[PDB]
């Protein structure tokens, strides 16, 4: 007594104004549900990983899908300018197929890890993989390597590239977060931190003035390059938070956060406040999503066999309509949101970077 | 404002240990102390489904919150 169920915070908005239908029965033949979406930086191809196999790529104009026979699920997919798809498999290998045919072109291996987190930088042609104790970085063509950047001390936790700019940010098991000179194996930017975060990814804004750090602990660390240290502040999250699995960025001030309390959050960095708070069901839970950064169009695969076709601006205006009616009455959205405030220095991930 | 015993689930040969609900309002789940669980709906014309398994006692049944799988 009395927990919060079912799909009351997800399908209830996501299906609000659809212009098409996902004929779910077309895609879900498994005794099972979609657990993750691995996806296209160009958003449209949203592949569905289930608990069965044949990872598919769902194509949302055709109401058809790409069937890529092998069962091996991805940690993430990268689709690029020329029609190719790179699949970072959970099997330790990254398999590239032509996205358009599902035809294998190459496999990248170097990683010996359960995690091969991907990020793609379309302006470097570089694909980065976060795995084991390193960052393998390579030409997006994915037939060679440029180099691997390494953590030779405490265990590597994670890292990410800047997609409409150029940098690599990585971190340690001890939360130390640092920035690399992408062409010199050089860490120019270093940190010493108190929050030790396991199971983290560092999310990078496309023009990386802004960064955020997730992890095994329920705290988020925030960066702004206009100020020193790059990581300036951090703070605790609304009650019930546990750990954070993923954060993505948009062109607005926004972080899209997947928290393992099975609630999606969206945060506005100008004060670092939570605009959106939306939960998913048991099976069929938070899966993952794609974004059009300038209207925040969302291409989310919900594990329920629904793809939305909702966006953050519509979900925001829904929340902001509540507020606009009350802005007329003086409501402060920062508190409505849960704006979180900077604390002390002894639990921070403060980081200097140039 | 009545405790309202309404209409019982017929059968359930002996030995009853639990019940739960499918929030369609309602498919009722229940279970016995030997080899059987049941799931059925009212609108009494509906016939219940008798599940076979749990050759030992079934202590409790609960539905997933959406009323889909019945756990036993």
From Swiss-Prot, chain B:
Localization: Cytoplasm, Cytoskeleton, Cilium basal body
WD repeats: 11-50
Disruption phenotype: POC1-deficient mutant cells display a temperature-sensitive lethal phenotype. Mutant cells also exhibit reduced basal body frequency, basal body organization defects, and loss of oral apparatuses.
Superkingdom of origin organism: Eukaryota
Function: Required for structural maintenance of centrioles, ciliogenesis, and cilia-based motility.
Family label: Belongs to the POC1 family.
Protein name (record): POC1 centriolar protein homolog
Native organism: Tetrahymena thermophila (strain SB210)
Lineage: Eukaryota, Sar, Alveolata, Ciliophora, Intramacronucleata
Shown residues within the full chain: 35 to 106 of 634
């Amino acid at each position: 007594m009395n927990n919060i169920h079912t799909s009351t915070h997800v399908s209830t908005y996501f299906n609000e104004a659809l212009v098409d239908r996902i004929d779910t029965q077309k895609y879900l033949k498994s005794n099972g549900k979609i657990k993750k979406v691995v996806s296209d930086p160009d958003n449209h191809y949203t592949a569905a990983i289930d608990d069965s196999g044949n990872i598919t790529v769902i194509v949302h104009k055709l109401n058809r899908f790409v069937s890529i026979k092998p069962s091996s699920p991805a940690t993430h997919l990268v689709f690029i300018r020329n029609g190719n798809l790179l699949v970072a498999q959970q099997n330790g290998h990254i398999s590239q197929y032509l996205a358009s045919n599902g035809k294998l072109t190459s496999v990248i291996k170097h990683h010996n890890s359960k995690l091969l987190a991907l990020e793609y930088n379309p302006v470097t042609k570089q694909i980065l993989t976060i795995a084991n104790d390193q960052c393998t970085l390579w030409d997006a063509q994915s037939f060679n390597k440029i180099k691997t950047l390494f953590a030779k001390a405490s265990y590597f936790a994670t890292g990410s590239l800047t997609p409409n700019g150029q940098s690599l940010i990585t971190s340690f098991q001890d939360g130390n977060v640092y920035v690399w000179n992408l062409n010199n194996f050089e860490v120019t930017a270093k940190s010493e931190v108190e929050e030790n975060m396991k199971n983290q990814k560092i999310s990078v804004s496309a023009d990386s003035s802004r960064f955020v750090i997730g992890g095994s602990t329920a705290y988020l660390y925030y960066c702004d390059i206009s100020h020193s240290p790059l990581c300036i502040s951090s703070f605790a999250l609304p009650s019930g938070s546990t750990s954070v699995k993923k954060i993505k960025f948009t062109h607005g001030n926004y972080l899209g956060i997947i928290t393992d309390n099975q609630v999606f959050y969206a945060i506005d960095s100008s004060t670092n406040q939570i605009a959106l708070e939306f939960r998913l069901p048991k099976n069929k839970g938070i899966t993952d999503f794609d974004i059009n950064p300038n209207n925040l169009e969302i291409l989310i695969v919900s594990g329920n066999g629904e793809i939305f076709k909702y966006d953050l601006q519509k979900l925001f205006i829904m929340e902001m309509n509540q507020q606009q009616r009350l802005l007329e009455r003086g409501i402060e959205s920062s508190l409505v949101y849960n704006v979180l405030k900077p604390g002390n220095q002894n639990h921070s991930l403060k980081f200097e970077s140039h | 404002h009545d405790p309202a015993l309404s209409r019982s689930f017929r059968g359930h040969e002996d030995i009853i240990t639990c019940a739960d609900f499918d929030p369609k309002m309602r498919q009722v789940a229940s279970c016995s102390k030997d080899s059987i669980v049941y799931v059925w709906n009212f609108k009494p014309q509906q016939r219940p489904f008798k599940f076979v398994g749990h050759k030992g006692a079934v202590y409790c049944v609960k539905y997933s919150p959406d009323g889909e799988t019945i756990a036993s």
